Symmetry: C2
Subunit: 129 residues, 2 copies
């Protein structure tokens, strides 16, 4: 069980990510949380980090997400910035660089981020009085 | 990985449970799915079975849920019927009668049932072509 400041940086990013919806946030990610057994909390971390990396890599220049207006475009840029911030945190927490992602249900990025936010705050609670 | 007909009975109950909201469905259950590591799919099952048992036992005669009208009362009865149906299925699948439930985030029964529905259909997918 790690109780590093890193957890607060994860939660902070999740709070700017979920309050801001874009064109892209309703696209999909493998629902790593549709398993009937997440295994090892560092494996969970590797698992969320791996799926956020797949997302941002493939949607960074996705015509469906870039936007038309400067507002839309700016939001998009911020979405990509935050996913990379969050990923690097996740990877740093995992300290594991290879894990197996085998689920098939997909969820929107939006649901996925909200779930993760929830386990991140549970983690936080088990850490503090 | 079990692929028993039981899974369809679990999904069937979940489908009548989630389409029917009552006075009680917005009350809480320990979010067994706020862990950063569900362990063993039979443990997961034991875990959901244990928390649904706690719910129905304590809310069966909950004045907040019994209802005023015959409609409300009837719905309530059906909610309790289905939770017991689902629990017995879960327990039957677990084949494990003691597991540790240690999370602290709570979710409404409604969110909890929707999540479980999702892992139950993932289970179903990994079972069929």
């Amino acid at each position: 069980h790690k109780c590093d400041i890193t957890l607060q940086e994860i939660i902070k990013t999740l709070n700017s990510l979920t309050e801001q919806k874009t064109l892209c946030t309703e696209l999909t990610v493998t629902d790593i949380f549709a398993a009937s057994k997440n295994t090892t909390e560092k494996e969970t971390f590797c698992r969320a980090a791996t799926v956020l990396r797949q997302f941002y890599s493939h949607h960074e220049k996705d015509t469906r997400c870039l936007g038309a207006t400067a507002q839309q475009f700016h939001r998009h840029k911020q979405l990509i910035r935050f996913l990379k911030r969050l990923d690097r945190n996740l990877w740093g927490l995992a300290g594991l660089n290879s894990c197996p992602v085998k689920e098939a249900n997909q969820s929107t990025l939006e649901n996925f981020l909200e779930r993760l936010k929830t386990i991140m705050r549970e983690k936080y609670s088990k850490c503090s009085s």
